């Protein structure tokens, strides 16, 4: 029913420097005296953590480094310094009239030094075989930025049916990102070829990382 | 010590209403507000309606009045959440939040609902040893493979949740109305196969509690 808007939707911040984040009304919700404004935290798979209230008032457990200010439609939030911890997704929500909404969202992530990821090329296991599936996994950790390409080789030429990605939320610690692929194949495809390749391009390096085996060995 | 325990995930055919419930402890269940709060995956929040446990007394949103209905028990002090004829934009992970005017200071875990009209499926775990050949050194990394399963979610354990320190956990993506999720842990080629390392997987549909040893091949 209010409107929140988030600006910017994603911001970029390097480890120990200073984070805007403004969050517009479409009605003033500090109407009869005092903002009603609360401001969240929210990790992957973790419900929302109440920063801030009121937009000025902090709640027990959160450290002053956690910084919000505004009134009537205009209010931001400010984290000074950040840590690797910080990496969320924040909200903020409206009280007083009439149903609670919260904002639009806007994410946080960090820059730091450019990380090239370790490589590793996993052959089906034994009891895929007996079921009749076989799946080649390939295996990219730590690593930053989060642009990366993956391509499989299969005997010297691409494949790119049946291919499963998935890529990791930033690191809580390290502040790396991580991807795993696979070639989703049947027995009956994976004994005709004998060569698969993992192929990766970043931008640490030109040459891709290639990892590769043999089904002969 | 306050705390809020929200039951399990849930899966559920189109046009059957399901019940969500709240456990809350460490505190006087009757005289504190409870909010419900909708997120659509990969989305933001919404405020689904307040419920006061002393007696009945709710105001949902306008969006949601006509779906979903609030009952708390105070003998059990369990807050809980009917959710008439599931569709397709319903499936989402639904929060209860303990509140003290104006903002939701505790959180529960979150029920991830999922509509979803499949069939539930067992899932398949592939131990994921380095390719074939005696050792390489320095440090080698381990995988988990988690084939064709169904619904959400599969909770990873590495060594009952010793070592997990160094362990990247993908999250799942569907492909043909099936779930697949992959699991990486990089060690120190000491401690490998001197130590034994064990993969944990738990799946609530299915009732299924594989644990597989990785060997070398």
């Known amino acids: 029913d209010i409107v929140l808007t988030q600006s910017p939707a994603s911001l970029a911040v390097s480890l120990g420097q200073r984070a805007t984040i403004s969050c517009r009304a479409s009605?003033?919700?500090?109407?009869?005296?005092?903002?009603?404004m609360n401001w969240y935290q929210q990790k992957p798979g973790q419900p929302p953590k109440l920063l801030i209230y009121?937009?000025?008032n902090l709640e027990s457990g959160i450290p002053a480094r956690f910084s919000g200010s505004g009134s009537r439609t205009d209010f931001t939030l400010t984290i000074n310094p950040v840590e690797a911890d910080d990496v969320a997704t924040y909200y903020c929500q409206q009280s007083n009239e009439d149903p609670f909404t919260f904002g639009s969202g806007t994410k946080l992530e960090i820059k730091r030094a450019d990380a090239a990821p370790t490589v590793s090329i996993f052959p089906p296991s034994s009891k895929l075989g007996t079921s009749g599936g076989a799946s080649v996994v390939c295996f990219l950790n730590n690593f930053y930025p989060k642009d990366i390409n993956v391509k499989w080789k299969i005997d010297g030429s691409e494949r790119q049916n049946g291919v499963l990605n998935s890529w990791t939320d930033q690191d809580s610690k390290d502040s790396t990102y991580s991807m795993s692929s696979t070639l989703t194949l049947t027995k009956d495809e994976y004994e005709r070829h004998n060569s698969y390749t993992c192929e990766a391009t970043h931008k640490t390096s030109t040459s891709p990382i290639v990892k590769s085996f043999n089904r002969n060995e | 010590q306050v705390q809020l325990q929200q039951s399990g995930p849930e899966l559920v055919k189109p046009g059957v209403s399901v019940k969500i419930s709240c456990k809350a402890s460490?505190?006087?269940?009757?005289?504190?507000?409870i909010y419900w709060v909708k997120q659509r995956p990969g989305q933001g929040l919404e405020w689904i309606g307040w419920?006061?446990?002393?007696?009945?007394?709710?105001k949902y949103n306008e969006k949601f009045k006509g779906k979903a209905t609030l009952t708390a028990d105070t003998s059990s002090s369990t807050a809980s959440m009917q959710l008439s004829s599931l569709t397709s934009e319903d499936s989402a992970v639904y929060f209860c939040?303990?509140?003290?005017?104006?903002?939701?200071?505790?959180w529960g875990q979150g029920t991830s609902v999922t509509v979803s009209s499949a069939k539930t499926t067992a899932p398949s775990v592939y131990p994921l040893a380095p390719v074939c050949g005696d050792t390489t050194g320095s440090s080698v990394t381990l995988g988990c493979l988690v084939k064709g399963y169904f619904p959400e979610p599969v909770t990873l354990t590495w060594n009952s949740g010793s070592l997990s320190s160094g362990v990247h956990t993908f999250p799942a993506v569907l492909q043909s109305d099936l779930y697949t999720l992959s699991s990486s842990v990089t060690v120190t080629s000491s401690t490998w196969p001197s130590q034994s390392i064990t993969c944990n997987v738990a799946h609530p549909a299915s009732s299924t509690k594989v644990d597989k040893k990785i060997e070398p091949r």
């Open positions: 009121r937009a000025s």
């Open positions: 939040a303990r509140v003290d005017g104006y903002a939701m200071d505790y």
């Open positions: 009605e003033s919700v500090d109407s009869y005296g005092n903002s009603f």
């Open positions: 460490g505190y006087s269940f009757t005289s504190f507000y």
């Open positions: 419920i006061f446990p002393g007696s009945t007394n709710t």
